[PDB]
Amino acid sequence: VIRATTWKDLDLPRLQHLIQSSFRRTLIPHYFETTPLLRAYVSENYRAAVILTKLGNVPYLDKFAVLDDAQGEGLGRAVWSIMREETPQLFWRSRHNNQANAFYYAESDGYYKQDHWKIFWNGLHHFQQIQQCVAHCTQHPPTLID
Amino acid sequence: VIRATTWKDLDLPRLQHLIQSSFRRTLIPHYFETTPLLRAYVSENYRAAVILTKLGNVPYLDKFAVLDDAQGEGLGRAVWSIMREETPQLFWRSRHNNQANAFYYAESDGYYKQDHWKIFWNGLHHFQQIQQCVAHCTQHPPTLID
Ligand SMILES: CC(=O)N[C@@H](CCC(=O)O)C(=O)O
Ligand SMILES: CC(=O)N[C@@H](CCC(=O)O)C(=O)O
Ligand SMILES: [Cl-]
Protein backbone atom coordinates (compact mmCIF):
# COMPACT_ATOMS: atom_id res chain seq x y z
CA VAL A 1 0.00 0.00 0.00
CA ILE A 2 1.30 3.41 -1.07
CA ARG A 3 1.26 6.00 1.72
CA ALA A 4 1.39 9.63 0.59
CA THR A 5 1.28 12.95 2.43
CA THR A 6 1.32 15.09 -0.72
CA TRP A 7 -0.54 14.77 -4.02
CA LYS A 8 2.88 15.00 -5.70
CA ASP A 9 3.62 11.47 -4.49
CA LEU A 10 0.67 9.93 -6.33
CA ASP A 11 -0.27 9.22 -9.95
CA LEU A 12 -3.18 11.62 -10.04
CA PRO A 13 -4.70 10.62 -13.41
CA ARG A 14 -4.67 7.01 -12.26
CA LEU A 15 -6.19 7.95 -8.89
CA GLN A 16 -8.89 9.97 -10.65
CA HIS A 17 -9.69 6.94 -12.79
CA LEU A 18 -9.98 4.76 -9.68
CA ILE A 19 -12.32 7.24 -7.99
CA GLN A 20 -14.47 7.67 -11.11
CA SER A 21 -14.63 3.92 -11.74
CA SER A 22 -15.56 3.14 -8.12
CA PHE A 23 -18.21 5.84 -7.74
CA ARG A 24 -19.39 5.64 -11.40
CA ARG A 25 -19.34 9.44 -11.53
CA THR A 26 -17.00 12.26 -12.50
CA LEU A 27 -14.47 13.80 -10.10
CA ILE A 28 -14.98 17.56 -9.93
CA PRO A 29 -12.47 19.62 -11.92
CA HIS A 30 -9.52 20.86 -9.83
CA TYR A 31 -10.23 18.38 -7.03
CA PHE A 32 -6.55 17.69 -6.33
CA GLU A 33 -5.65 21.38 -6.59
CA THR A 34 -8.34 22.51 -4.13
CA THR A 35 -8.37 19.63 -1.60
CA PRO A 36 -6.00 19.84 1.42
CA LEU A 37 -4.54 16.34 1.69
CA LEU A 38 -3.72 14.90 5.11
CA ARG A 39 -2.77 11.34 4.08
CA ALA A 40 -3.72 9.00 1.25
CA TYR A 41 -3.40 5.22 1.18
CA VAL A 42 -3.56 3.63 -2.27
CA SER A 43 -3.14 -0.04 -3.16
CA GLU A 44 -0.08 -0.70 -5.31
CA ASN A 45 -2.10 -1.11 -8.49
CA TYR A 46 -4.68 1.60 -7.76
CA ARG A 47 -7.64 -0.73 -7.11
CA ALA A 48 -8.52 0.72 -3.66
CA ALA A 49 -7.84 4.04 -1.94
CA VAL A 50 -8.51 5.87 1.31
CA ILE A 51 -8.08 9.64 1.22
CA LEU A 52 -7.90 11.65 4.46
CA THR A 53 -8.26 15.41 4.21
CA LYS A 54 -8.32 18.48 6.42
CA LEU A 55 -11.87 19.36 7.50
CA GLY A 56 -11.88 20.75 11.02
CA ASN A 57 -10.15 19.24 14.06
CA VAL A 58 -10.76 15.55 13.25
CA PRO A 59 -9.25 13.79 10.21
CA TYR A 60 -11.92 13.51 7.48
CA LEU A 61 -12.15 10.46 5.23
CA ASP A 62 -13.05 12.17 1.98
CA LYS A 63 -12.93 9.14 -0.31
CA PHE A 64 -13.12 5.38 0.15
CA ALA A 65 -12.80 4.18 -3.44
CA VAL A 66 -12.83 0.43 -4.01
CA LEU A 67 -13.27 -1.28 -7.39
CA ASP A 68 -16.08 -3.85 -7.38
CA ASP A 69 -13.57 -6.44 -8.60
CA ALA A 70 -11.20 -5.85 -5.66
CA GLN A 71 -13.67 -7.05 -3.04
CA GLY A 72 -13.05 -10.81 -3.43
CA GLU A 73 -9.43 -10.25 -2.36
CA GLY A 74 -10.54 -7.80 0.35
CA LEU A 75 -8.30 -5.02 -0.97
CA GLY A 76 -10.49 -2.17 0.27
CA ARG A 77 -10.58 -3.71 3.74
CA ALA A 78 -6.81 -4.08 3.69
CA VAL A 79 -6.23 -0.41 2.78
CA TRP A 80 -8.74 0.68 5.44
CA SER A 81 -6.89 -1.38 8.05
CA ILE A 82 -3.58 0.31 7.14
CA MET A 83 -5.17 3.72 7.52
CA ARG A 84 -6.62 2.76 10.91
CA GLU A 85 -3.19 1.82 12.30
CA GLU A 86 -2.33 5.54 12.10
CA THR A 87 -5.74 7.13 12.51
CA PRO A 88 -7.45 6.67 15.87
CA GLN A 89 -9.94 9.47 15.22
CA LEU A 90 -11.79 10.09 11.98
CA PHE A 91 -15.21 10.82 10.52
CA TRP A 92 -16.86 10.38 7.13
CA ARG A 93 -20.15 10.38 5.27
CA SER A 94 -21.93 7.80 3.12
CA ARG A 95 -24.96 7.61 0.85
CA HIS A 96 -27.85 5.66 2.33
CA ASN A 97 -27.60 3.04 -0.45
CA ASN A 98 -23.80 2.60 -0.35
CA GLN A 99 -22.87 -1.09 -0.57
CA ALA A 100 -20.07 -0.24 1.88
CA ASN A 101 -22.50 0.64 4.69
CA ALA A 102 -22.46 -2.85 6.26
CA PHE A 103 -18.66 -2.55 6.49
CA TYR A 104 -19.01 0.96 7.92
CA TYR A 105 -21.45 -0.27 10.58
CA ALA A 106 -18.87 -2.88 11.63
CA GLU A 107 -15.86 -0.54 11.54
CA SER A 108 -17.26 2.64 13.10
CA ASP A 109 -17.60 3.62 16.76
CA GLY A 110 -20.61 5.78 16.06
CA TYR A 111 -23.26 6.76 13.55
CA TYR A 112 -25.76 9.55 12.99
CA LYS A 113 -28.43 9.33 10.29
CA GLN A 114 -29.12 12.60 8.49
CA ASP A 115 -31.34 13.40 5.50
CA HIS A 116 -28.68 13.02 2.78
CA TRP A 117 -26.04 11.18 4.59
CA LYS A 118 -25.11 8.51 6.99
CA ILE A 119 -22.40 10.04 9.18
CA PHE A 120 -19.81 7.75 10.80
CA TRP A 121 -16.86 8.22 13.12
CA ASN A 122 -14.16 6.48 15.13
CA GLY A 123 -12.50 7.41 18.38
CA LEU A 124 -14.55 10.46 19.42
CA HIS A 125 -15.61 10.72 23.08
CA HIS A 126 -16.70 14.35 23.11
CA PHE A 127 -20.27 14.88 21.92
CA GLN A 128 -19.69 18.51 21.01
CA GLN A 129 -17.03 17.33 18.53
CA ILE A 130 -19.36 14.59 17.25
CA GLN A 131 -22.07 17.20 16.69
CA GLN A 132 -19.56 19.32 14.79
CA CYS A 133 -18.51 16.38 12.61
CA VAL A 134 -22.16 15.81 11.72
CA ALA A 135 -22.46 19.49 10.73
CA HIS A 136 -19.33 19.27 8.57
CA CYS A 137 -20.76 16.32 6.62
CA THR A 138 -23.99 18.17 6.02
CA GLN A 139 -22.25 21.40 5.00
CA HIS A 140 -19.28 20.18 2.97
CA PRO A 141 -19.85 20.64 -0.78
CA PRO A 142 -19.87 17.60 -3.12
CA THR A 143 -16.79 16.65 -5.15
CA LEU A 144 -18.52 14.15 -7.47
CA ILE A 145 -20.56 15.44 -10.42
CA ASP A 146 -21.97 14.58 -13.77
CA VAL B 1 -49.94 -8.41 19.60
CA ILE B 2 -50.54 -8.13 23.34
CA ARG B 3 -50.02 -4.60 24.69
CA ALA B 4 -49.50 -4.39 28.44
CA THR B 5 -48.81 -1.47 30.81
CA THR B 6 -48.43 -3.64 33.94
CA TRP B 7 -46.55 -6.91 34.57
CA LYS B 8 -49.81 -8.28 35.99
CA ASP B 9 -51.28 -8.37 32.47
CA LEU B 10 -48.57 -10.75 31.23
CA ASP B 11 -47.68 -14.42 31.73
CA LEU B 12 -44.37 -13.84 33.47
CA PRO B 13 -43.02 -17.42 33.60
CA ARG B 14 -43.76 -17.70 29.89
CA LEU B 15 -42.10 -14.34 29.21
CA GLN B 16 -39.04 -15.32 31.27
CA HIS B 17 -38.77 -18.48 29.19
CA LEU B 18 -38.94 -16.42 25.99
CA ILE B 19 -36.23 -14.02 27.19
CA GLN B 20 -33.91 -16.76 28.43
CA SER B 21 -34.48 -18.79 25.24
CA SER B 22 -33.85 -15.83 22.93
CA PHE B 23 -30.70 -14.65 24.70
CA ARG B 24 -29.47 -18.12 25.77
CA ARG B 25 -28.65 -16.62 29.16
CA THR B 26 -30.32 -16.40 32.56
CA LEU B 27 -32.58 -13.54 33.61
CA ILE B 28 -31.42 -12.07 36.94
CA PRO B 29 -33.55 -12.91 39.98
CA HIS B 30 -36.70 -10.85 40.47
CA TYR B 31 -36.21 -8.93 37.31
CA PHE B 32 -39.97 -8.41 37.05
CA GLU B 33 -40.44 -7.05 40.56
CA THR B 34 -37.54 -4.60 40.23
CA THR B 35 -38.08 -3.47 36.63
CA PRO B 36 -40.29 -0.41 36.17
CA LEU B 37 -42.44 -1.32 33.16
CA LEU B 38 -43.48 1.41 30.75
CA ARG B 39 -45.19 -0.88 28.27
CA ALA B 40 -44.67 -4.28 26.71
CA TYR B 41 -45.56 -5.70 23.32
CA VAL B 42 -45.77 -9.49 23.20
CA SER B 43 -46.78 -11.63 20.23
CA GLU B 44 -49.76 -13.88 20.98
CA ASN B 45 -47.62 -17.04 20.99
CA TYR B 46 -44.89 -15.43 23.13
CA ARG B 47 -42.27 -15.95 20.40
CA ALA B 48 -41.36 -12.25 20.25
CA ALA B 49 -41.42 -9.38 22.74
CA VAL B 50 -40.49 -5.71 23.05
CA ILE B 51 -40.23 -4.45 26.62
CA LEU B 52 -40.05 -0.69 27.23
CA THR B 53 -39.08 0.44 30.72
CA LYS B 54 -38.53 3.62 32.72
CA LEU B 55 -34.94 4.80 32.59
CA GLY B 56 -34.50 8.57 32.46
CA ASN B 57 -36.70 10.75 30.27
CA VAL B 58 -36.79 8.68 27.07
CA PRO B 59 -38.51 5.28 26.70
CA TYR B 60 -35.85 2.58 27.13
CA LEU B 61 -36.06 -0.67 25.20
CA ASP B 62 -34.88 -3.05 27.90
CA LYS B 63 -35.49 -6.35 26.06
CA PHE B 64 -36.05 -7.28 22.42
CA ALA B 65 -36.50 -11.02 22.68
CA VAL B 66 -37.15 -13.00 19.51
CA LEU B 67 -36.90 -16.76 18.93
CA ASP B 68 -34.80 -17.90 15.96
CA ASP B 69 -37.45 -20.48 14.99
CA ALA B 70 -40.64 -20.03 12.85
CA GLN B 71 -40.49 -16.67 11.01
CA GLY B 72 -38.61 -15.06 13.91
CA GLU B 73 -37.40 -12.22 11.69
CA GLY B 74 -40.88 -11.51 10.34
CA LEU B 75 -42.49 -11.71 13.77
CA GLY B 76 -39.85 -9.64 15.54
CA ARG B 77 -40.17 -6.97 12.86
CA ALA B 78 -43.97 -6.96 13.23
CA VAL B 79 -43.81 -6.41 17.00
CA TRP B 80 -41.13 -3.73 16.60
CA SER B 81 -43.29 -1.98 13.99
CA ILE B 82 -46.27 -1.84 16.34
CA MET B 83 -44.08 -0.43 19.11
CA ARG B 84 -42.62 2.26 16.83
CA GLU B 85 -46.07 3.48 15.73
CA GLU B 86 -46.60 4.47 19.37
CA THR B 87 -43.00 5.35 20.25
CA PRO B 88 -41.26 8.18 18.37
CA GLN B 89 -38.27 8.34 20.73
CA LEU B 90 -36.39 5.47 22.32
CA PHE B 91 -32.94 4.19 23.16
CA TRP B 92 -31.42 0.79 23.85
CA ARG B 93 -28.16 -1.11 24.10
CA SER B 94 -26.67 -4.32 22.76
CA ARG B 95 -23.63 -6.51 23.15
CA HIS B 96 -21.57 -7.35 20.04
CA ASN B 97 -22.98 -10.80 20.77
CA ASN B 98 -26.65 -9.84 20.14
CA GLN B 99 -28.30 -11.34 17.04
CA ALA B 100 -30.41 -8.25 16.35
CA ASN B 101 -27.48 -5.90 15.65
CA ALA B 102 -27.91 -5.81 11.86
CA PHE B 103 -31.58 -4.91 12.40
CA TYR B 104 -30.55 -2.24 14.91
CA TYR B 105 -28.04 -0.73 12.47
CA ALA B 106 -30.82 -0.49 9.86
CA GLU B 107 -33.61 0.74 12.16
CA SER B 108 -31.80 3.23 14.38
CA ASP B 109 -31.16 6.93 13.81
CA GLY B 110 -27.76 6.68 15.43
CA TYR B 111 -25.47 4.74 17.71
CA TYR B 112 -22.41 5.07 19.90
CA LYS B 113 -20.10 2.27 21.01
CA GLN B 114 -18.81 2.39 24.61
CA ASP B 115 -17.45 -0.14 27.12
CA HIS B 116 -18.58 -3.25 25.20
CA TRP B 117 -22.04 -1.80 24.59
CA LYS B 118 -23.48 -0.54 21.34
CA ILE B 119 -25.96 2.20 22.31
CA PHE B 120 -28.73 2.95 19.80
CA TRP B 121 -31.48 5.54 19.56
CA ASN B 122 -34.43 6.71 17.47
CA GLY B 123 -35.96 10.16 17.34
CA LEU B 124 -33.35 12.04 19.38
CA HIS B 125 -32.46 15.47 18.08
CA HIS B 126 -30.41 16.93 20.93
CA PHE B 127 -26.88 15.68 21.60
CA GLN B 128 -27.70 16.63 25.18
CA GLN B 129 -30.31 13.84 25.17
CA ILE B 130 -28.07 11.42 23.31
CA GLN B 131 -25.21 11.78 25.72
CA GLN B 132 -27.50 11.23 28.70
CA CYS B 133 -28.90 8.10 27.06
CA VAL B 134 -25.36 6.81 26.49
CA ALA B 135 -24.66 7.51 30.16
CA HIS B 136 -27.77 5.59 31.26
CA CYS B 137 -26.78 2.55 29.21
CA THR B 138 -23.22 2.43 30.46
CA GLN B 139 -24.32 2.75 34.10
CA HIS B 140 -27.29 0.37 34.01
CA PRO B 141 -26.52 -3.01 35.60
CA PRO B 142 -26.78 -6.10 33.38
CA THR B 143 -29.99 -8.10 33.92
CA LEU B 144 -28.81 -11.12 31.93
CA ILE B 145 -26.28 -13.37 33.64
CA ASP B 146 -24.19 -16.48 32.99
C1 LIG C 1 -16.12 8.17 2.43
C2 LIG C 1 -16.48 8.62 1.02
O3 LIG C 1 -16.18 7.95 0.03
N4 LIG C 1 -17.20 9.86 0.89
C5 LIG C 1 -17.57 10.37 -0.41
C6 LIG C 1 -18.99 9.96 -0.73
C7 LIG C 1 -19.52 10.64 -1.97
C8 LIG C 1 -20.82 10.17 -2.57
O9 LIG C 1 -21.25 9.04 -2.27
O10 LIG C 1 -21.46 10.90 -3.37
C11 LIG C 1 -17.50 11.86 -0.40
O12 LIG C 1 -17.05 12.50 -1.40
O13 LIG C 1 -17.87 12.53 0.61
C1 LIG D 1 -32.35 -4.17 23.49
C2 LIG D 1 -32.07 -5.32 24.45
O3 LIG D 1 -32.56 -6.43 24.27
N4 LIG D 1 -31.17 -5.09 25.57
C5 LIG D 1 -30.91 -6.15 26.52
C6 LIG D 1 -29.83 -7.06 26.05
C7 LIG D 1 -28.46 -6.47 25.90
C8 LIG D 1 -27.47 -7.50 25.44
O9 LIG D 1 -26.91 -8.24 26.29
O10 LIG D 1 -27.25 -7.63 24.21
C11 LIG D 1 -30.57 -5.56 27.84
O12 LIG D 1 -30.79 -6.23 28.88
O13 LIG D 1 -30.08 -4.38 27.92
CL1 LIG E 1 -12.69 -4.92 -0.03
CA distance A15 to A21: 10
Structural contact between residues B118 and B126, judged by C-beta atoms closer than 8 angstroms: no
Of B102, B110, B131, the CB nearest to A111: B110
Nearby residues of A98 by Cβ (< 8 Å), 6 or more positions away: A104, A118
Residue A62 CB less than 6 A away from ligand 1: yes
Residue B144 CB less than 6 A away from ligand 2: yes
Chain A: which residues have CB within 8 Å of chain B? 102, 105, 108-113, 127-128, 130-131
> How big is the A-B interface in CB pairs under 8 Å?
27
Burial class (CB in 10 A: 0-12, 13-18, 19+), A136: middle
Among the bound ligands, name the one nearest to the CA of residue B76. 2
Can you say whether the dihedral through the CA atoms of A124, A130, A134, A135 is positive or negative?
A: negative
Among the bound ligands, name the one nearest to the CA of residue B138. 2
Please list every residue in chain B whose beta carbon sits closer than 8 Å to the beta carbon of residue A91.
none
Q: How many of the other CB atoms lie within 10 Å of CB of A122?
A: 19
Structural contact between residues A41 and A64, judged by C-beta atoms closer than 8 angstroms: no
Residue A47 CB less than 6 A away from ligand 1: no
Distance B46 CA to ligand 3 centre (A): 41
Residue B118 CB less than 6 A away from ligand 2: no
Looking at CA atoms only, how far is residue B108 from chain A in angstroms? 8
Q: Which CATH superfamily is domain B1-146 in?
A: Gcn5-related N-acetyltransferase (GNAT) (3.40.630.30)
Cα–Cα distance list, A79 to A38, A49, A64, B59 (Å):
16, 7, 9, 41
Q: Which helix (H) or strand (E) holds B105?
A: helix B101-107
* Mutation probe of ligand 2 site: the residue of B94, B105, B108 with most atoms within 8 A of C-beta: B94
What is the stated resolution of the deposited model, in angstroms? Answer: 1.4
Q: With helix as H, strand as E and coil as C, how does chain A read?
A: CEEECCHHHCCHHHHHHHHHHHHCCEECCCHHHHCCEEEEEECCCCCEEEEEECCCCCCEEEEEEECHHHCCCCHHHHHHHHHHHHCCCEEEEEECCCCCHHHHHHHCCEEEECCCEEEEEECCCCHHHHHHHHHHHHHCCCCEEC
What are the residue ranges spanned by the domains of chain B?
1-146
- Ligand 2 atom closest to B92 (CA): 1
Cα–Cα distance list, A21 to A3, A99, A138, B115 (Å):
21, 15, 25, 39
Residue B100 CB less than 6 A away from ligand 2: no
Contact A110 B113 (CB under 8 A): yes
Determined by X-ray
* Mutation probe of ligand 2 site: the residue of B27, B42, B60, B144 with most atoms within 8 A of C-beta: B144
Nearby residues of B53 by Cβ (< 8 Å), 6 or more positions away: B35, B36, B37, B38, B59, B60, B62
Please list every residue in chain B whose beta carbon sits closer than 8 Å to the beta carbon of residue A135.
none
CA distance A137 to B143: 38
